[PDB]
Structure 1
């Protein structure tokens, strides 16, 4: 029993897609037509039954009901896949991406407090918080320190929860989220705490599909970065805290060579005093290099729905 490649189904696909329809958006029709064709065929090829089909439909409802589509997306490799395509294009244009890009993740929040050169991003509400001095230099496309660059950083606390997405509703707005404008020396410096890794909500749809694939839904500890500056393309990346069990086994496949950074521990009272800290602290250094706009155009910025508070 095969009917996909019969005139009836083929003409039906054009109808359902609004192809012969006058109004509408041709780009959407084009994509829908292709998607539907593939799904109708996959249904026949894999002999998907109605029982299976409807199970799939129910999954989509609960996926959206839990607002987890942006979480399952990276878990199924789409996010990394899109970065791969962007790298391939940059390679085509002859652009050398000094600091490699990686996925943004679905937890960015716009509207964080902004300051120049330095900033403390945690509010101390975290008990297990281990002080972390993260700092580096921002280089323009010519390798020269770039003053006035906007560095945006966001990460989870020791429980693996981000502010605005903390189920305990324990965090104040923008905790561990800050924008730092680079100083006269193109430097940024922040005092925060070592983030903990985290996984998908165990009861959530993303995690349960993952179970069906025999995969886990964990991410190693990391720190997200957005770096933008005049005449430069917006850099999206993150750094992985070296030593994490899932550094090279992140369910979001975001890890890359050059993004893994070692956290140096300092117990020496001489260090603890230079860096106005109360006691032992970890230190991480990470410089990032930006690329120029391609003819006054940032050909890789992504306009995507992002929570703004």
Structure 2
């Protein structure tokens, strides 16, 4: 209420000032209004807002230091994921899964460098097909390439899955329309894998990890890229199946 008065008026002055400086004409104004009505008539608001701004909303709420870097949450988020204690600890995947086989390896330590046994690491990512879990007419609503993973008591974590590939935001919806058509660019996101991490007495982390030589690194449609988060790739041909091995050392909050 007093906070919204502050921002709202500060916001207002700013847009008005934009209209005045750029002499926004009526047809223009009307084209914006129609456009916004679009975005809402589809369901792309969270899509649209997260794609341009949440990278910034994250660089403020969490912070910007040796905390291992934060990345956008993203509409695709998994709630109530399944616990995993598998043999080499695979993620749930439809049999004879296309895509490169992938192995992630890493840790959960803090400031000091001592493991935080009480951690819970939630992971999710798209198919090689370019479709996420739950929501796509081509996929069941059932937990696939999503899950919750506990670290070892020394800290270390590991899981198997498949190698994600760059997803493009629909070339056809208002957001894509903007990225592709009117702005004349691309709506591709670099191949990434999502991560959340919970604990007792630690601030939660939410982020992504990308890959080296990812074509859309230096042009993420959602601007969620940092340097600290681009992973080194180890190409190993366990023959028939070719493998991709990756490492990461997640550090955390501290309440």
TM-score of the aligned structures, taking structure 1 as reference length: 0.74
Instruction: Tell me which residue corresponds to 1:17.
Output: none
281-290 or 110-119, which moves further after superposition?
Answer: 110-119
Q: Is the 8 A contact 1:148 1:186 kept in 2?
A: no
State the superposition RMSD in angstroms.
2.3
50-59 or 114-123, which moves further after superposition?
Answer: 114-123
User: Quick one: structure 1 residues 201 and 125, their matched pair in 2 at CA, closer, same or farther if it must change by over 3 Å?
Assistant: farther
Q: Does residue 1:251 correspond to 2:251, yes or no? A: no
User: Quick one: structure 1 residues 33 and 125, their matched pair in 2 at CA, closer, same or farther if it must change by over 3 Å?
Assistant: farther
List aligned pairs for 1:198-277, cutoff 5 A.
Answer: 198-210=167-179, 211-268=181-238
Shift of 1:111: 1.2
Q: Does residue 1:40 correspond to 2:16, yes or no? A: yes
Give the SS at the match of 2:218.
coil
Give the SS at the match of 1:266.
strand
User: Quick one: structure 1 residues 248 and 40, their matched pair in 2 at CA, closer, same or farther if it must change by over 3 Å?
Assistant: closer
User: Quick one: structure 1 residues 256 and 135, their matched pair in 2 at CA, closer, same or farther if it must change by over 3 Å?
Assistant: same
| Counterpart selection for 2:248 from 265, 283, 286 | 286
Q: Is the 8 A contact 1:102 1:237 kept in 2?
A: yes
**Separation in 2, partners of 1:179, 1:253:** 26
List aligned pairs for 1:1-309, cutoff 5 A.
Answer: 25-76=1-52, 78-86=53-61, 90=63, 96-116=65-85, 119-125=89-95, 127-166=97-136, 168-210=137-179, 211-268=181-238, 279-293=241-255
Shift of 1:183: 2.2
Structure 2 unaligned regions, length at least 5: none
* Number of residue pairs matched by the alignment: 253
Q: Is the 8 A contact 2:135 2:141 kept in 1?
A: no
User: Quick one: structure 1 residues 280 and 215, their matched pair in 2 at CA, closer, same or farther if it must change by over 3 Å?
Assistant: closer
Structure 1 unaligned regions, length at least 5: 1-24, 270-277, 294-309
Q: Is the 8 A contact 1:126 1:158 kept in 2?
A: no
**Separation in 2, partners of 1:122, 1:113:** 9
282-291 or 120-129, which moves further after superposition?
Answer: 120-129
**Separation in 2, partners of 1:155, 1:108:** 10
**Separation in 1, partners of 2:5, 2:100:** 52
Q: Is the 8 A contact 1:263 1:283 kept in 2?
A: yes
Q: Is the 8 A contact 1:131 1:192 kept in 2?
A: yes
Shift of 1:32: 2.8
